[PDB]
Design a protein around this ligand. Structure first.
Ligand SMILES: CC(C)CCC[C@@H](C)[C@H]1CC[C@H]2[C@@H]3CC=C4C[C@@H](O)CC[C@]4(C)[C@H]3CC[C@]12C
Ligand SMILES: CCCCCCCC/C=C\CCCCCCCC(=O)OC[C@H](O)CO
Ligand SMILES: CCCCCCCC/C=C\CCCCCCCC(=O)OC[C@H](O)CO
Ligand SMILES: CC(C)(C)NC[C@H](O)COc1nsnc1N1CCOCC1
Ligand SMILES: CCCCCCCC/C=C\CCCCCCCC(=O)O
Length: 442
């Protein structure tokens, strides 16, 4: 139908436009802004490149093959088009597997969020991917090791107006296992460990950085008292110079109301140490700290950090039920407090920690932890976009008459739309957000 062709033509054009402009913007943002020239962003550059090659050389000719129902580019370009197509996908899934593995080695290292690979080393890994995956994508098609022995296929090979991808059962299993499933199985298992390590390796220092936050300039909290760094109270006095005086003495230099990351961490390491020391000095809190597990020990430290040894001691009724290990019971009395009303968002997180005995409340609450979530969304979406096509592709190998030709192309296109999703997912990263709007002048 006429309306169907024009209708599909517009949909496919807006898909192609979204692929190219999206990835160009991403590549441009990493190339221009220094703050985005990281090891993990260099892998994203390789991912965005493969996604750009898709919408520039693959997807455009794919559309013409559907709207005209015939190949009008020759048998040399037909095989080259298919070779690039496979490479784009193979390079993308291996890139995602590398990102996953590099994230495991970073989280297991004492660096926790910084990569063990250098900028020169990362370039080698990317170049090795494109070379290795380039060989497994071009050699099995150019040497015609992919060609089937049935008449319908040999007729399509000889025909210059036929580019229907016909294959033998061997290649269909071999190429799909090496190219897609092997990096996918590894990626899923390795990045599930990355998520498991992130949640498990959560500590009080990260927990307070989540709750209190970070600001290197003097600000007023909910209570209204002068604060700086990670919830470090300066004075209860409503005077800026009084707040500045107590600050310059603590650091030991002319700060002028501004501190560094090195300085903010230094006072934070002191406050945390003072909180625990205050618990050990307090007779009411001392036996409660003993009975609690590592996770709930941090939750008591968190309250002592915000209110103070004396303030936390006032919850006599609640503390008694923490010792009794009746978490759900203690939580109700903790909720029935002025502290709960003062900071409900922070109170919920701390109360839930006591209830669960896990960091489940502080799940992806950290900025470094949000970065991992975004990368997990990229890998997970690639799976949802490509796995249906790959399952049906291997189902076709076992039984020939299982699915129609229209089902194969439709599922292949589900994977094609994926090359337009990745730039929109980078909107989660505030570093990319600022880069994008700067290049778009908004
Ligand atoms: C279609 C085929 C033949 C062309 C393949 C394109 C090749 C040349 C491209 C695609 C991805 C590219 C890489 C993307 C990532 C980076 C990070 C950047 O900081 C330095 C260059 C480097 C390492 C690129 C080198 C060239 C590269 C490997
Ligand atoms: C045709 C595709 C063009 C692909 C070329 C894009 C890769 C170059 C790139 O993005 O890298 C910039 C710079 O080297 C980062 O430091
Ligand atoms: C389409 C292919 C490439 C577009 C991406 C641009 C290729 C990279 C060129 C270098 C660049 O854009 O960076 C300039 C930057 O502003 C100075 O630091
Ligand atoms: C069939 C067509 C139109 C050339 N698209 C190819 C697909 O987009 C993906 O191709 C692949 N990339 S990695 N492994 C594969 N496959 C899928 C098709 O069968 C051979 C192995
Ligand atoms: C399948 C999607 C792969 C993404 C890895 C995350 C695994 C997980 O949910 O723990």
């Amino acid at each position: 139908d006429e309306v169907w062709v024009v209708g599909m033509g517009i949909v496919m054009s807006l898909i192609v436009l979204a692929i190219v402009f999206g990835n160009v913007l991403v590549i441009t943002a990493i190339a221009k802004f220094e703050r985005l020239q990281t090891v993990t962003n260099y892998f994203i550059t390789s991912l965005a490149c493969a996604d750009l090659v898709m919408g520039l050389a693959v997807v455009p000719f794919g559309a013409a093959h559907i709207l005209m129902k015939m190949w009008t580019f020759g048998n040399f370009w037909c095989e080259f088009w298919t070779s690039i197509d496979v490479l784009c996908v193979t390079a993308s899934i291996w890139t995602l597997c590398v990102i996953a593995v590099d994230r495991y080695f970073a989280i297991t290292s004492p660096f926790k969020y910084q990569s063990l690979l250098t900028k020169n080393k990362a370039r080698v890994i990317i170049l090795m991917v494109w070379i290795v995956s380039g060989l497994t994508s071009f050699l099995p098609i150019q040497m015609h090791w992919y060609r089937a022995t049935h008449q319908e296929a040999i007729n399509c090979y000889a025909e210059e107006t036929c580019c229907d991808f016909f294959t033998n059962q061997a290649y269909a299993i071999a190429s799909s296992i090496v190219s897609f499933y092997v990096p996918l199985v590894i990626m899923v298992f390795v990045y599930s460990r990355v998520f498991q390590e992130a949640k498990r390796q959560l500590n009080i220092f990260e927990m307070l950085r989540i709750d209190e936050g970070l600001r290197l300039k003097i600000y007023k909290d909910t209570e209204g008292y002068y604060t700086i760094g990670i919830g470090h109270l300066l004075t209860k006095s409503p005077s800026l110079n009084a707040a500045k005086s107590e600050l310059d003495k603590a650091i030991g230099r002319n700060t002028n109301g501004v501190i560094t990351k090195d300085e903010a961490e230094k006072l934070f390491n002191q406050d945390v140490d003072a909180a625990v020391r205050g618990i050990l000095r307090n007779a009411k809190l001392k036996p409660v700290y003993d009975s609690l597990d590592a996770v709930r020990r941090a939750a008591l430290i968190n309250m002592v950090f915000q209110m103070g040894e004396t303030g936390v001691a006032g919850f006599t009724n609640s503390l008694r039920m923490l010792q009794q290990k009746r978490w759900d019971e203690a939580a109700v009395n903790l909720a029935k407090s002025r502290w709960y009303n003062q900071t409900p968002n922070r109170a919920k997180r701390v109360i839930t920690t006591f209830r669960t005995g896990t960091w489940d409340a502080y799940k992806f609450c950290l900025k470094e932890h949000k970065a991992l979530k975004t990368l997990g969304i990229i890998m997970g979406t690639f799976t949802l976009c490509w796995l249906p096509f790959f399952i049906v592709n291997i189902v076709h190998v076992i039984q020939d008459n299982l699915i129609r030709k229209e089902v194969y192309i439709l599922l292949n296109w589900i994977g094609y739309v994926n090359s337009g999703f990745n730039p929109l997912i980078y909107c989660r990263s505030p570093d990319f957000r600022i880069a994008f709007q700067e290049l778009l002048c908004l």
